[PDB]
Amino acid sequence: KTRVLVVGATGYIGKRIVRACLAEGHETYVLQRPEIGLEIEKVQLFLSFKKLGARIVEGSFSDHQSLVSAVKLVDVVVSAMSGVHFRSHNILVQLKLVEAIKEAGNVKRFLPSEFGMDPPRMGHALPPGRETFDQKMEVRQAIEAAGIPYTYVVGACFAAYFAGNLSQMVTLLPPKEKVNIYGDGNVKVVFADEDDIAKYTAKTLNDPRTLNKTVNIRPPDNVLTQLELVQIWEKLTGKELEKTNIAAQDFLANIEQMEIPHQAGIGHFYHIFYEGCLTDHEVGEDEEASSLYPDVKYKRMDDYLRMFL
Amino acid sequence: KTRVLVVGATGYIGKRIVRACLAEGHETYVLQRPEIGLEIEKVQLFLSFKKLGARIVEGSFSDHQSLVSAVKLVDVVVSAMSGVHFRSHNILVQLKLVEAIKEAGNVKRFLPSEFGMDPPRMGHALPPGRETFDQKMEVRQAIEAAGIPYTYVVGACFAAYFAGNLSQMVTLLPPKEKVNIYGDGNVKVVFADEDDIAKYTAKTLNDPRTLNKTVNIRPPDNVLTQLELVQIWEKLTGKELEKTNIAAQDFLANIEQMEIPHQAGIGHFYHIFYEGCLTDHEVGEDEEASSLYPDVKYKRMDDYLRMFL
Ligand SMILES: NC(=O)C1=CN([C@@H]2O[C@H](COP(=O)(O)OP(=O)(O)OC[C@H]3O[C@@H](n4cnc5c(N)ncnc54)[C@H](OP(=O)(O)O)[C@@H]3O)[C@@H](O)[C@H]2O)C=CC1
Ligand SMILES: NC(=O)C1=CN([C@@H]2O[C@H](COP(=O)(O)OP(=O)(O)OC[C@H]3O[C@@H](n4cnc5c(N)ncnc54)[C@H](OP(=O)(O)O)[C@@H]3O)[C@@H](O)[C@H]2O)C=CC1
Ligand SMILES: COc1cc([C@H]2OC[C@H]3[C@@H]2CO[C@@H]3c2ccc(O)c(OC)c2)ccc1O
Ligand SMILES: COc1cc([C@H]2OC[C@H]3[C@@H]2CO[C@@H]3c2ccc(O)c(OC)c2)ccc1O
């Protein structure tokens, strides 16, 4: 039985990873930091994990020895640390976890908080969006310096942030009548239900095929252009949307004057929808999660969008 | 089937009320406000409501006619508006809901956001905690000046904020070794699991017995002193905790110099555990929810506390 520590267990993807580890059959440990005082939602999340059979491990990122103690309990550590500018962007805090793993020496694999664009492929991104890739690379740098075996889970847009809103920024719901199309809207993007991301993570974390590998989440039916995604919704609703095509220069105009979390968002959307960073390179079946784990009947984006009807 | 609208549907008690209305068989509507921007957890709560069978109603408190349109759809309106200083304390925003109910004319009953201490009994309270009772009384006044029929649900401490922490402030977990006892710890308090509070709400909101009444949530097995609460925990754990008795004037010492949310917390705790405001007066079976709805097998605190072992 694989023992797994989830660090970031109440996070957006972290909580889905916890439940996926439990359903996969792993002996699932969750790190509970003691600073969560009156954050009642976090406290009841941990209590719901307990009721599912998770085991709470108390530890703190400012107590190096408590991290060492926690990781010594498990075979695999999965980190879901924050990495979104408008939420919180504390990627580099994992360095203390890496150090703790380095000292414990028992850890057979570490999955750091990746779950998005492929960091080493983003060397061209400009600040502040660039921070995400620079800081994940630095965590990668520490992992491989320490000789810690790893798996990097990358390659898909969370469906909540990019599909349920027809990729409109600052909203999470489909628009009623108007939609902005990025460029011609013919650039292929990779989408995935976050619950499937979690299930692929639970399955890959002890799979020899993915030891010391980048694993890509690129389910073939979910490779869609923005216009394809829009047209799915128009078909489901029986209503055409008025589409405005936004050229690259107008999308980025005056970016330097906007608040930093919005600058990052714009930078990321530009890589995804204008440069097509998630599909501008091919990946093999031996490094792609839908083909590695074909028993995951992943949710297609028409079924994902139906939830919004 | 009673048609119910919940305003505050993603709130702490609000989401529990939505689910209990659905389980009770009400045709349940929930107000989705448009300023839900990137608050993904709210967005996904509504999706979870829809799948359980709730109907989404769009409206904004800054758009009076949207509110009138919403309350027109239902027979009863339940408000779970915020009212905790360290969370947010927007009780007075319900005045706009009351005004829309007035104009609509069809609402058979309105339950405002109370769910705690009985406001008219708290006239002696001092600021800032006093604001809770004053604003809840201003809402009561506007309800009655509009002729809207009502039910006021009051009388119990939410289990998570007062029982699961053995009533220690700024924490939501049982303490590991040491516990503060307020006074002698022999002042009776009322505790209720918040899912039972929601079930009673769902059961009372169309009950002829409770039209234009105050309904008290005072389950007899859950009327306990703080020492009795601590004794339940100590028998669950087999370990005695070290108890420190805190006298009134030491509990309140230098209260004027602390943050306003903490001041309000101390004021509330003083009224509950030093004055006994939840038990310094009696209520008939006619107006108490556990006798009113005896098929609700309310969770006793020993079972509640087991979630924390
Ligand atoms: N479309 C995509 O592909 C997306 C990719 N991502 C990536 O997913 C990963 C997770 O992001 P997300 O789920 O939104 O993150 P969250 O913002 O939900 O944060 C996750 C966890 O971060 C922990 N955390 C935050 N700050 C600290 C801190 N100072 N010290 C210790 N722990 C801290 C918390 O642990 P705890 O549970 O202990 O409190 C928190 O729950 C990130 O790398 C992100 O970049 C995320 C959004 C979209
Ligand atoms: N022990 C006890 O007896 C306790 C009693 N209470 C009482 O419970 C009741 C609800 O409190 P609680 O669950 O903590 O509420 P929350 O703090 O969870 O807020 C509940 C809802 O208030 C709505 N809200 C907040 N601000 C606004 C605003 N400006 N405009 C429109 N809507 C707003 C939101 O509705 P939306 O979902 O639509 O976003 C939110 O989800 C209160 O009267 C409180 O005093 C609370 C805790 C303990
Ligand atoms: C797709 O890969 C990533 C996606 C993201 C997204 O986390 C979600 C964000 C972010 C920028 O895309 C969300 C975003 C930021 C700004 C917005 O206005 C927004 O609107 C939906 C959404 C972060 C890191 C990634 O490697
Ligand atoms: C019991 O009646 C009420 C309780 C409350 C509680 O919502 C919860 C609060 C508040 C003050 O008691 C929670 C409180 C505030 C400060 C704290 O430090 C705290 O620690 C657990 C908890 C609000 C209104 C009420 O009428």
Author numbering:
A (entry chain C), B (entry chain D): 9 to 317
What does the paper say about this structure?
In contrast to IiPLR1_NAP_ + PIN, the β4 loops of AtPrR1_NAP_ + PIN and AtPrR2_NAP_ + PIN can be clearly identified. Within the twisted loop, His93 and His97 “grasp” helices α5 and α10, while Val92 and Phe94 interact directly with (+)-pinoresinol; Arg95 strongly interacts with NADP+ as well as each of the GXXGXXG motif and α2-helix from neighboring protomer of the dimer. Similar conformational changes of β2 loop and α10-helix can be seen by comparing the structure of AtPrR1_NAP_ + PIN with that of AtPrR1_NAP and the structure of AtPrR2_NAP_ + PIN with that of AtPrR2_apo. Furthermore, Leu46 (corresponding to Val46 in IiPLR1), His276 and Phe277 of AtPrR1 are positioned similar to the corresponding residues of IiPLR1 to effect substrate binding or product release, except that the β4 loops cover the substrate/product, which are disordered in the IiPLR1 structures. Therefore, the entrance and orientation of the substrate in AtPrR1/2 is more tightly controlled than in IiPLR1.
Pinoresinol/lariciresinol reductase (PLR), an NADPH-dependent reductase, converts pinoresinol to lariciresinol and subsequently to secoisolariciresinol. We found that, for all 16 structures we solved, each enzyme adopts a similar head-to-tail dimer conformation, strongly suggesting that each PLR/PrR functions as a homodimer, consistent with the literature that TpPLR1 exists as a dimeric entity in solution.
